[PDB]
Write a protein that binds this ligand. Sequence first.
Ligand code: OLC
Ligand code: HG
Length: 254
Amino acid sequence: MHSLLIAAILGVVEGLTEFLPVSSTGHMIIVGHLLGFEGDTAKTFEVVIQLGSILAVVVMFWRRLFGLIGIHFSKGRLTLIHILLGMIPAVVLGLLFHDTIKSLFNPINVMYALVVGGLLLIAAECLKPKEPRAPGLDDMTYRQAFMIGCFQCLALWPGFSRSGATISGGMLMGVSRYAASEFSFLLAVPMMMGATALDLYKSWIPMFAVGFITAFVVALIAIKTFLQLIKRISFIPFAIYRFIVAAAVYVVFF
Ligand SMILES: CCCCCCCC/C=C\CCCCCCCC(=O)OC[C@H](O)CO
Ligand SMILES: [Hg+2]
């Protein structure tokens, strides 16, 4: 009776922490450990429900995503070249270091990426310019998009919260918190869709239906609130929250 309940608990977690700088992978290992869902099947299940979070960004940015690829229906406009430049370096670094990255998945490394990721969010807050260089999404430049991407190499460290890494570099390149968040979401669509496909390949029954779907729903609510929320809130509360999670990763496993 609780196979569906566990998937609901894991789904609301994944959908919530996927696009918030709070280390989706870190929350899953602690909750999966507290529940007892730790087998290889759990990891496969977790990659599946990541697809639901993807579709949430797909439906949230349906008009803009297809716009980048030519399916329409400041005066600049964000182009597909921005997305490509944002994902070139992580792909190149991710392809070359696959066996090495997969070795970093122990919980101790998550504890550090939780702390170090929070330090970076603080440094982005203290160091970001007073006047944003790109207050809107369509104001971004190829240099900002690429520097954000070369900054996404850190997300290959398990527990770093790819959103937190991507948004930090956005703020440090002069992109507003709102646009830096919008770009991290749009950038996650090609990244997650390809990465999960890459993970679904090497890993091979209705428990997915609950998890995939409920993660799609919660992500929509979180991703819509967070964008409206971040208009008036900083990333300091998120960075400090990652420290409380880091102690928990130590608490649950050590
Ligand atoms: C009192 C309740 C909270 C208890 C936990 C205390 C947090 C201390 C932990 C780590 C250091 C964090 C460094 C402090 C963050 C920077 C403070 C700040 O003012 O940020 C600058 C601003 O965001 C841009 O101008
Ligand atoms: Hg890089």
